[PDB]
Amino acid sequence: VTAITKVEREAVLVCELPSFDVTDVEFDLFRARESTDKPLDVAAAIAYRLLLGSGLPQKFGCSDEVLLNFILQCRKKYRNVPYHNFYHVVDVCQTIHTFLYRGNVYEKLTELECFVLLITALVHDLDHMGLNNSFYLKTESPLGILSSASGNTSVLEVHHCNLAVEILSDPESDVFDGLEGAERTLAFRSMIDCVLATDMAKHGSALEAFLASAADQSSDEAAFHRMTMEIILKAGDISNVTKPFDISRQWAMAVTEEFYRQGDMEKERGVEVLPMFDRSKNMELAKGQIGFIDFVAAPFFQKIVDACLQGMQWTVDRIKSNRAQWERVLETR
Numbered sequence: 610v611t612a613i614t615k616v617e618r619e620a621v622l623v624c625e626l627p628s629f630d631v632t633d634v635e636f637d638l639f640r641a642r643e644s645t646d647k648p649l650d651v652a653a654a655i656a657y658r659l660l661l662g663s664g665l666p667q668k669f670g671c672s673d674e675v676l677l678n679f680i681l682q683c684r685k686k687y688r689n690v691p692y693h694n695f696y697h698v699v700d701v702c703q704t705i706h707t708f709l710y711r712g713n714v715y716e717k718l719t720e721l722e723c724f725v726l727l728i729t730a731l732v733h734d735l736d737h738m739g740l741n742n743s744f745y746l747k748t749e750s751p752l753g754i755l756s757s758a759s760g761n762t763s764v765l766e767v768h769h770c771n772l773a774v775e776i777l778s779d780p781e782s783d784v785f786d787g788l789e790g791a792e793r794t795l796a797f798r799s800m801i802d803c804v805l806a807t808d809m810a811k812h813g814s815a816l817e818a819f820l821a822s823a824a825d826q827s828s829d830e831a832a833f834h835r836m837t838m839e840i841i842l843k844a845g846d847i848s849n850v851t852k853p854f855d856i857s858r859q860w861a862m863a864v865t866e867e868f869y870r871q872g873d874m875e876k877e878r879g880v881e882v883l884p885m886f887d888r889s890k891n892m893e894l895a896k897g898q899i900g901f902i903d904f905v906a907a908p909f910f911q912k913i914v915d916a917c918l919q920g921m922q923w924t925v926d927r928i929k930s931n932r933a934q935w936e937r938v939l940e941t942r
C-alpha cells in the first residue's frame with residue numbers, strides 16, 4: 610500500500626467545516642457532503658476533527674500526520690456504493706463520538722478503549738462491495754468458499770479486519786504505533802473483536818451477552834469493557850433510525866438502493882432474492898423503517914439504555930419520534 614502524499618493531506622487540511630458542530634447529536638453529514646464539491650475531503654476532515662477533538666491520539670503517541678495518513682488509507686479502501694462507502698464509516702465514527710461524550714459512555718471505558726472505538730469505526734467496513742455475507746455464500750463466490758472452508762461465515766467482517774491489519778502494519782499510518790506490550794495487543798484485539806461483532810447474524814447473542822454482563826456486578830471487568838465496546842460499535846452501525854427524521858430517511862434510501870443492486874445481481878445469477886432486495890416488490894420505505902424499528906432498533910436501544918447506558922436515552926426518544934413520523938406517512942397516504 611502506497612504512502613499518503615503531502616498534497617492528499619493538504620486537501621483535507623484546507624476544509625474548515627464552517628457552521629458544523631461535528632460533536633452534536635443533530636450533526637447532518639448529508640448537509641456537510643452538499644456543502645462543497647469535495648465531499649470525500651470534508652468527510653475525512655470530519656473524522657480528523659472528531660479524533661483530534663477527543664484529545665486521544667495525542668495521549669497515545671499518535672501524531673496529527675499519522676492520524677491523517679490512517680484516515681486517508683481507510684478512505685482509499687471504500688468503494689463508490691450507495692450505503693457502505695466512506696460516508697457510512699465517518700457517520701459511525703461521529704455517532705460513536707456522541708454515544709461516548711454526549712451519552713457519557715466514555716465513563717464505562719478507558720481512554721485507550723475510547724480511542725480504539727473511534728479508530729475502529731473508520732475500518733469496520735473496509736472494501737465493502739455493497740453485497741452482504743449471504744450473497745457470497747449463496748453464489749459460492751471464492752470469498753464465500755474460503756469463509757466456508759476456513760470455518761468462519763462472517764465473510765465480510767474477517768475481510769475488513771485483514772485490510773485494517775494491512776493499514777496498521779506501516780508506521781506512517783499506524784495510530785497504535787505509540788503503544789507496546791499489553792496495550793498494543795488490547796488495541797488490536799478489541800478493534801478486531803468489535804469488527805467481528807458487527808455481523809448481524811450474531812446480533813441476538815452479542816446483545817444477550819452484554820445484558821447478562823451489565824446485570825452481573827461480579828462480571829469480569831475486562832470482559833464487560835470488551836462487550837461494551839462491541840455493543841457501542843453495533844449501536845453506531847444501526848444508529849440511522851436514532852437520527853433526525855430527514856437524515857434517517859436519506860440513509861434508508863441509500864440502504865434500499867444498495868439492497869436493490871444486490872437483488873438485481875442475485876436475479877442475473879439465478880439465486881434466492883429476498884423481498885427487501887427486489888425492486889419489483891416496491892416495498893414502502895415507511896413499513897420497512899417501522900419494521901426495523903419494532904423488531905431490531907427499538908428493543909436494542911431500549912435494552913442497552915435500561916441495562917447500563919442511561920445517558921443514551923435520547924436514542925430511544927428519537928426512535929419513538931421517527932416511528933410516529935413514519936406512522937403519519939402511512940396515515941396520510
Ligand SMILES: [Mg+2]
Nearest residue numbers: 733734765807
Ligand atoms: Mg459491516
Ligand SMILES: [Zn+2]
Nearest residue numbers: 697733734846
Ligand atoms: Zn457498517
